[PDB]
Symmetry: C3
């Protein structure tokens, strides 16, 4: 609760994170569990590889520990493996770095916990039931007593938003203006979108937080990037920086590939054996979390919007069925159910139809076949309405390409709605492929864009008095960043928010935070909008 | 895409069918699968009857093909069966007729495929996502360039409807005016309705397409039926025709009975072993598909209406529970679950309670008993609302007897809503009974109505300039076929659409096809209706 | 259908009960089943205790009846048990009393059956589909012909309500004004509510129907309780009466405890073995059936309101999840699914991984663990809205504390909504604990309130001309029993309906029974309410 604290972006971010992971104790436990999962994957894997005698386990009454070798021998058997010892040393160094960051993080989170209890007065018991809106209103009222925000002003409830979301507004504006290569033209497929967790991590490590990034403070852009001249040498320097970060990625490829595979296998294989159709359900697509996101939108508001609108979207995606697969399913079900009905009537009649060379395996395989086909057979009496489903999905989601509203029922619309909605299986596949795909996209597809990235960060970076250097769009300025088709805008092409992000983002903010005082242009815009809504 | 083609009814029907079975390839495959199902049922059955040595299979390690007899012996064993060889010869003749019709059909469908691609310009890829409305608008715009409709006029979008649905409007009007015996008074039951697939096939074979039917062209009624005189000799001729068609049915009874038995056995026996309650779900009742159908309503519009309104109807049917069966279920569940809980506690305690003469079979039978009873026990906390359920079911369905709206909750209403909604099990039973029941209804209950059928076809058959001879009701003429209670109508009794079919059918058509230009009386009617709706 | 019958409260109650248990036959069967369940529990239990030779059954091919001992020995083995014979004699005396009451009840119900058939003219076939509203309208029209209601007036449709619900309105008003101890302050828990079936039975046996109750006739209060004086001696007499009834409860404690144990064991043990999560579903809480109930509300109207509003309430209760349990579930699922995926991959690879000392039991236990955790893991994409859920729950339920409407999302609101909504498991536990808890609450917590109970029954008991002595609140008088905050009321504190029961109860009655003629003040109140609703 200190006066003139430190970097305020971090303080506010930590406060927000403490509200999200409901309380200090919960958060501490969550982090500890996160550290134990890594160590368990690595140690379980190295135990399975190195200490277990599979031959005795398989064939050659045997108790479980009859397989395991004694530690006095496991240590020697794992030590005489240069590749394994090297992977373990790199894994242990990453782990120790993560454990040290965790200790430092909890030592800094006890300070936020004391902030809550003593200056906000929200006990950790009343924190899960507490409405981040109420939390930040407490903070804004506290700004008087326990002084913060070194010496600029009183907090204005959007400052906190800018502090928590400075780099995320930059990502939103980068992806919104089609920098940052995502679309690819694969042979044998349409234009794929490849945006993963590792790729966005690399983009942020290149642009925002690193040794030689664009930013020096975490709230101020380096002084040269604001200068119009010397843009070409800056572009060359950025290109070399991203080249070498891509090469580090290419060299770390084997280790991250191993991690993604062990790890994929340690959860999704269980789910596969249980319910193989859980991976046929669809998830909201990291590209799509960044596309459908308003500018100053905290994570919980985006996710509330995203799951309010999830079941409409599943009803839409299941409308759409291929006739050929449906017919193949129907008829395979007929023929398999016929042979199975005959074999079942026989095994019921005499009961010795069973234990005939292949009858039992045949019954089981035929049952699996009938079940798969019946899962592919659409439910008769299914209401097919892709227009109203798309209308309600939009009402929850707020952003959609413009060539969707008319032709809701075509393959073009369905095909690029799957850009946003994504079978979970292609998610797991796409997270597996990112170790081997991220370096080459990073080296080849982004380095040509470095001169456009430099011009973005020079052109769209405003200095706001209290917060520092923020994105130019996240101001929610209807002027200078509007879009003439949605709407007064003093914005030409290249200087405009594409899918209506400025207008819809300002509306979403004004609706979610009713306490905020809207500037002149924003107030006039919202008033004219309300007049048009109530009039028309 | 030819000029002055052929019979246009067939051309249009084929075009519509090609749109429905989404594309030529899909349709071809579907027909091939339809041909392979027949051949598989017959060949699998004759293999099970004739080639398999059940004794060795049952009792007397044995591989599966140890049962089968060698073909050099299967041929002789199937050939020395006069009944089997005769059934196989009749089956093979029906098959060859169906295969020849299939070859002719695909040779005629390649012409419709070329029509699409070259004159409509809708590739087979864009056809599943294509909206029959858009397809027929293409057709109506094409009528200028690739000339069709030999020489009468330009197409008016209702001509295509009449062409595709000429005989189906006749069936709708026949069933609507209570010709065509459907209601029967069985002893021990209420008035049953027996309308099947085979019965309607026989009605159409008698009336519409045959050697000596009412129609000579497929678009023109024979010349004598338009004459008022000689009605009695025509009635006698029709009565003799239907007598001999009924006798052909009675003679073919054994073969169609065998077909229905086998074919139901295969599929529904599999479903029975899987989920015996799937046959307790209810389907929309061939009588009911013809009762709830508007006049000029293509199959996909009826089915869209029928499944939009399916779940309300299931919620209605499950409201209604017999108290005696509910009480018997509750108490049988109590006593069975009590004995099973005791036996389960014992088998858990010692684990040797099992392998006691009858304990395991008792546990299994008691589990089945508890599950059946719990399925019959209504869900407590079930909202019982048969008035609003009937209101929404009507909103989807549009046609309901008039003595339903008040007493939605009685046994009279539920009992004759099951005329339309029909357990799937009574559907399979009613399709099994049709081989043995259709000849006797056809000989006894319809031959007395022949003089009324002749008067129907003489009185209600208009000659419309472009289309030929169509039903008089399907014109959707508010005059001369109205109903005074629904509504100006110059229609007395016997000359009126009963359940409001004219008014509601004209409204449904005007709503589904917004491009159609409504005649004077229809326009005035729809305008007055809109004024009354917006006023009241 | 007799003229000047008997006590009319009983006649009307019986008529209502006959309508509820749909018909005489159904009702008779239900009662017979109720008698057979008691006898079966007792006889099955005494057979399991006394006649079965568990040693031979467990260890020492054996047919089931090899366990049972011959009756010539079972009689002697059950007779030489003083405790068992005593429990059986008390059980048989209670049974014989119940059988005698059943015979008398059906001999009195044949009279109501003849009443229906001959004076109301509703056959038992048309009775399940018959709408108690229609039944009582028949009754009110019958009041002219088959004369009833000895000589006061014609029936006014609220008289029947008072007759059926005289003592239940008293319970509603007792619980509504916080007499009748329900809230308790347990250590280690919040303020528990303990209101069971046995406790309310004891309250009614003390107050309403007994040897020396408050009422002498069933429709008239004893003459002394109307007198202001002698209140202290009446309070002492009531205190002694409730002391001795509590002591009878304390002495009968072992037998009712045995009954509850057995009876819960049978049914809920079966359900436990089947679906252990059925006991995690929530039920509407005997306290809560009495709290949410309007004054003159028959049982079926309350239950219709209670299940119309059940699924909203379950959606509310499940949008509250503890973060710590959710995190523990997620991570236990991870670690268990990881070890199980490894063991499953091994058993798939070689198939002899199985039959290794503990692998199969480990796979089963791990599967149970993963399933339990996945049940505790909240469904991602779950819409969390406790404000609109509470709004719709209120719309169905009509009564709620006033400090709920604002903070729908807190632990205070959830914690005292579980007062009304109650896991089924705590219901079964709370019905088990009532034999041992009811005597001590009855002796200690209610005897101090006897002087307030006397003042309640003296102050709030009006003599209405046709019905006799009814509760003062159940008149639905907006004056003299209103509440100034809801609303003209001439009611001070202690003389007012707390949660708005008078106003909302009068509204519910006027809406459910549209035929009733509302008195002056009630009519003016309802009119002003309608004017305010349509105005604001
Ligand atoms: C110049 C060099 C550049 C090279 C850079 C490489 C970039 C890619 C590296 C990827 C990696 C390196 C680890 C490799 C280990 C090697 C050891 C050898 C192993 C041999 C045996 C770190 O990278 C992750 O780090 C995260 C931050 O830690 C980032 O998100 C930040 O996180 C927060 C901040 O605390 C804030 O929310 C915010 O700041 C960011 O959102 C991620 O964006 C990033 O992918 C892997 O860590 C990852 O593990 C995966 C599960 O595989 C985790 O999955 C997630 O959570 C699971 C449930 O828990 C679910 O299962 C899974 O569905 C879910 O998705 C990831 O979350 C991540 O933890
Ligand atoms: C040739 C030079 C190369 C040297 C190594 C650098 C390699 C490049 C990355 C280095 C990297 C991890 C390694 C990447 C993971 C690899 C995955 C696979 C690897 C194994 C397969 C270590 O990060 C720091 O580690 C420090 C030591 O631990 C180093 O000491 C330095 O010197 C000392 C004195 O001068 C200083 O006192 C000391 O403070 C310095 O830090 C630093 O050099 C380094 O920057 C960066 O990761 C991390 O960056 C941070 C922001 O920084 C990210 O911030 C998160 O999100 C932001 C929200 O907006 C906010 O930032 C923040 O709210 C949030 O927490 C994290 O999400 C996190 O991901
Ligand atoms: C003077 C003499 C009069 C005698 C007339 C008899 C009238 C009754 C005969 C009935 C029969 C004779 C076959 C007997 C074989 C004997 C061989 C011996 C066997 C010994 C071993 C033909 O009759 C059917 O023919 C159809 C046309 O082919 C008709 O519909 C037309 O169809 C289209 C046009 O192509 C157009 O849509 C339109 O024009 C009509 O809608 C049907 O109405 C008619 O029932 C049987 O065929 C039938 O098989 C059944 C499944 O049993 C099929 O079931 C349907 O599809 C299944 C999924 O695929 C499902 O399982 C099933 O749920 C579903 O219901 C039927 O569809 C039908 O194919
Ligand atoms: C004592 C005389 C008796 C002779 C036999 C006739 C027996 C009566 C029916 C004969 C029957 C099948 C047999 C019934 C099935 C039996 C089931 C059980 C049987 C085994 C247990 C064969 O139909 C034709 O077969 C031809 C040869 O294959 C014959 O050759 C003739 O002579 C040549 C030169 O003069 C000519 O060139 C040749 O074109 C002639 O056809 C014809 O006689 C016969 O009409 C009719 O079935 C079929 O009728 C057609 C419309 O016709 C129905 O149309 C469908 O729906 C309509 C949509 O609106 C439209 O029509 C159409 O869009 C659609 O496709 C079909 O749904 C279909 O069902
Ligand atoms: C001075 C002395 C005072 C002492 C008073 C004690 C007060 C508590 C006694 C409790 C007891 C004494 C029996 C003990 C047997 C001892 C024999 C020895 C056994 C050794 C081996 C009678 O008490 C019950 O009697 C009922 C009336 O009969 C009362 O409700 C009235 O009922 C109607 C009127 O007919 C009218 O609706 C109305 O008037 C009241 O609503 C109940 O409120 C009362 O609890 C037990 O009876 C009970 O059995 C339980 C199931 O355990 C029954 O459960 C219910 O139905 C089940 C499905 O059927 C379900 O499973 C269960 O979920 C459900 O809850 C109860 O319903 C009840 O029948
Ligand atoms: C030291 C004296 C003690 C003597 C014994 C009395 C003990 C106290 C209760 C006695 C009790 C059962 C015992 C309690 C259960 C115990 C559970 C565990 C026990 C074993 C562990 C027997 O009830 C009666 O039984 C009679 C004989 O069978 C007795 O004969 C008497 O003398 C004769 C000539 O003068 C008379 O002709 C004869 O008519 C007298 O009845 C009476 O004394 C007794 O009142 C009362 O239970 C019952 O009360 C009735 C209303 O009364 C309740 O009414 C129900 O709900 C009401 C709706 O608003 C309405 O009333 C009604 O619509 C409905 O039906 C019932 O729900 C029911 O529960």
């Amino acid at each position: 609760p200190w006066h003139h604290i430190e970097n305020l972006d971090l303080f506010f971010s930590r406060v927000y994170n403490l509200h999200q992971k409901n309380g200090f104790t919960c958060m501490l436990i969550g982090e500890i569990f996160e550290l134990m999962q890594f160590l368990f994957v690595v140690a379980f894997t190295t135990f399975l590889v190195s200490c277990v005698d599979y031959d005795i386990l398989f064939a050659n009454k045997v108790t479980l520990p009859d397989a395991f070798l004694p530690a006095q021998v496991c240590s020697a058997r794992i030590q005489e493996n240069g590749s394994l010892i090297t992977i373990l040393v790199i894994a242990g160094v990453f782990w120790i770095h993560r454990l040290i960051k965790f200790i430092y993080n909890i030592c800094c989170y006890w300070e936020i916990h004391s902030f809550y209890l003593h200056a906000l007065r929200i006990p950790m018991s009343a924190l899960p039931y507490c409405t981040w809106q109420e939390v930040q209103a407490r903070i804004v009222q506290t700004q008087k007593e326990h002084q913060i925000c070194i010496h600029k002003r009183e907090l204005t409830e959007l400052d906190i938003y800018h502090r928590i979301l400075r780099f995320q507004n930059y990502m939103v504006a980068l992806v919104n203006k089609s920098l940052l290569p995502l679309r690819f033209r694969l042979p044998g497929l349409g234009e794929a979108v490849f945006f993963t967790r590792g790729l966005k991590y690399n983009f942020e490590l290149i642009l925002f937080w690193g040794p030689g990034s664009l930013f020096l403070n975490e709230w101020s852009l380096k002084a040269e990037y604001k200068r119009g001249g010397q843009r070409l040498e800056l572009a060359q320097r950025l290109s070399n920086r991203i080249l070498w970060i891509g090469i580090a990625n290419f060299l770390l490829c084997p280790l991250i590939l191993i991690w993604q595979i062990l790890y994929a296998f340690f959860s999704y294989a269980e789910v596969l054996k249980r319910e193989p159709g859980a991976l046929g359900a669809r998830c909201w697509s990291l590209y799509g979390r960044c596309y459908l996101r308003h500018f100053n939108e905290l994570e919980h508001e985006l996710q509330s919007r995203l799951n309010r609108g999830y079941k409409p979207a599943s009803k839409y995606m299941n409308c759409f069925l291929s006739p050929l697969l449906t017919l193949l399913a129907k008829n395979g079900a007929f023929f398999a159910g016929s042979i199975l009905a005959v074999l079942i009537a026989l095994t019921i009649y005499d009961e010795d139809v069973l234990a005939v060379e292949h009858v039992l395996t045949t019954v089981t395989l035929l049952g699996v076949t009938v079940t798969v086909c019946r899962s592919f057979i659409p439910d008769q009496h299914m209401v097919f309405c892709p227009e109203q489903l798309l209308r309600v999905i939009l009402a929850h989601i707020h952003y959609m390409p413009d060539h969707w509203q008319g032709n809701a029922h075509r393959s073009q619309t369905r095909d690029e709605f799957a850009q946003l909605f994504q079978y979970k299986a292609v998610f797991i596949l796409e997270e597996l492929l990112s170790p081997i795909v991220t370096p080459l996209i990073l080296i080849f597809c982004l380095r040509p864009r470095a001169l456009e990235i430099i011009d973005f960060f020079r052109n769209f970076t405003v200095e706001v008095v209290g917060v520092g250097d923020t994105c130019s769009f996240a101001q929610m300025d209807v002027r200078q960043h509007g879009h003439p088709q949605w709407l007064q805008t003093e914005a030409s092409v290249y200087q405009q928010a594409e899918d209506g992000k400025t207008e819809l983002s300002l509306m979403h903010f004004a609706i979610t935070n009713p306490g905020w005082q809207p500037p002149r242009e924003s107030t006039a815009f919202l008033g004219f909008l309300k007049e048009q809504v109530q009039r028309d």
